[PDB]
Structures are given as structure tokens and as C-alpha cells.
Design an enzyme around this catalytic site. Sequence first.
Site, short mmCIF file in Angstrom:
data_model
loop_
_atom_site.label_atom_id
_atom_site.label_comp_id
_atom_site.label_asym_id
_atom_site.label_seq_id
_atom_site.Cartn_x
_atom_site.Cartn_y
_atom_site.Cartn_z
N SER A 69 42.34 37.11 42.10
CA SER A 69 41.56 37.97 41.26
C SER A 69 42.02 37.83 39.79
O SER A 69 42.11 36.69 39.30
CB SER A 69 41.53 39.35 41.85
OG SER A 69 40.52 40.19 41.24
N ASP A 92 31.48 38.82 47.96
CA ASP A 92 32.55 39.45 47.19
C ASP A 92 31.92 40.41 46.20
O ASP A 92 31.09 39.96 45.40
CB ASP A 92 33.33 38.36 46.47
CG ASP A 92 34.56 38.87 45.71
OD1 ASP A 92 34.44 39.92 45.06
OD2 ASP A 92 35.58 38.18 45.71
N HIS A 104 36.91 40.94 48.67
CA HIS A 104 37.60 40.51 47.48
C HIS A 104 39.08 40.15 47.71
O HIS A 104 39.70 39.54 46.84
CB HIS A 104 37.49 41.62 46.44
CG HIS A 104 37.86 41.19 45.06
ND1 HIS A 104 37.03 40.43 44.28
CD2 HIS A 104 38.99 41.42 44.32
CE1 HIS A 104 37.63 40.20 43.12
NE2 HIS A 104 38.82 40.79 43.13
#
Length: 267
Positions: A94, A216, A245
Site C-alpha cells: 500500500s 481492491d 487491500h
Amino acid sequence: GVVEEAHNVKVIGSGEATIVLGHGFGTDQSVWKHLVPHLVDDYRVVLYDNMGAGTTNPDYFDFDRYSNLEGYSFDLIAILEDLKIESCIFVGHSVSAMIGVLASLNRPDLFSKIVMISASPRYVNDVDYQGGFEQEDLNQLFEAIRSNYKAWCLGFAPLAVGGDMDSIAVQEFSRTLFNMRPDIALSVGQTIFQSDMRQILPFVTVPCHILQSVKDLAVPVVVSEYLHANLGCESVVEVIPSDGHLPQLSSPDSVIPVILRHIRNDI
């Protein structure tokens, strides 16, 4: 050691061959729990927490330092220097994917490859770019975070993690989200959601592997194609038939083999 302690640094193994793993918003180094077992026999593995994670001391969270992603990149380089690491594979989840990219612009010598999981250089849409969110959607999110943090965490965790709403992974992410101090969560969420790394992508020189779940909440599939088209390095993309995610945590049986293949094999 001051840096070691502050970021909860853990080092497992001793070779030269080194993998450093950086986590995303709302979680901590425990997000890597299903990947690390399969790295430790071949690599020296380094885990750390980002400043502002709930496992870190809120007194060390300097709002000016972390007002841009560069602050977190300086932390990463500091951790590498403190450990005397001359080269690593960096795996960034991320926001850590962009943190690693930024670090690699300043110190490309420290990275042999970046493997990204759930990365995005820009979350906000414009008339020529799909990132997943309109500014007004982000405005609503920040207001929720401000108004009642526990309730926001409980609502957001299932959406972020995907899958079954009362899975263990949902529970774990709810816990880590709520472990953040609310002011810090709000500030970092805004800094991330308002970020823009698109303009620096052409300057990247370290090879990148771009991995994401097909579903996602925060990363439309076209973002992976955008990274691949605009990065100035050699890159490859692999979209995984997974939801979420944090798919390395919530869907390891389908996701860990993909991450491993990209770590162990060069473009």
C-alpha cells in the site's frame, strides 16, 4: 538502539541476501505473518513499523515530518543505514510501495528490486486519470474518521479487507486500525489520500513488480496498468484473483505464491 526501538525493527537471519518489508496504513508488520515463514530460510528478513502505526509511540509522530511521504522514505533509509544493509529487495504494501519508490530515487543503490502490493500513485480522479475516488468521497471519509473513530474503524475494516465480514483478518485489521491515535489516523489518511506520486514515476530506476488484488477498494486495476506504463524502470504487473487491500493477510493461499514468485525471480 533508538531507530530500532522506535520502529519495532526485527531482523530474522544473517545472510547478505536481504528482504525488507514495509506495511500499509492501518496495519503493522504483522500483516506479513503468512509471507515471512517462506522467506527466512533463504533471506535475512527485516520487518519494521511505520511511524504513526498504533504499535509506535505517538510522541515520535512529528506532523511536519510526515506531511509528505518523503518523511517515511527518510525513515526507511535510516533503518537500512542503521542495520548496515547495502542492498535489499523491498516489498512494499500500500503506501509503503510509494515510500520505497521515493527512497529509491534518493538511494537507488540500496535497492535491487521493489515488489509492490496494493500500490497507487494517486487515489483522486481527474478527467484523464482513474484513481478510485472523487475528492468529495475522500471528504466524507475524513469527516467519519473525525466524528467517531471506533465506529469508523468497525465499518471500514470489512470494506478494506474484503471477504467475509467477520473473518479473523477483518477482526485483526479493525484492531490495528483502532490502535492508532485518532488524530494521527486522520492526518495520515489525509496525507495518503491526497498524495501524488505520478510525476516522479518516470525517474524510477529500480525494477518494480506490481501486484494487486483484482478487487481492491482503493486500487482500481487500471492503476496497475498506469504504474507499468509510466514507471521509468523495467516493470511487470500481475493482478491476483483475490479480494482485498491486505490480501497477503486475508487470502494467503492464493496470494503468497504470487508474491514469492516475484521476490524469487527477476524480470
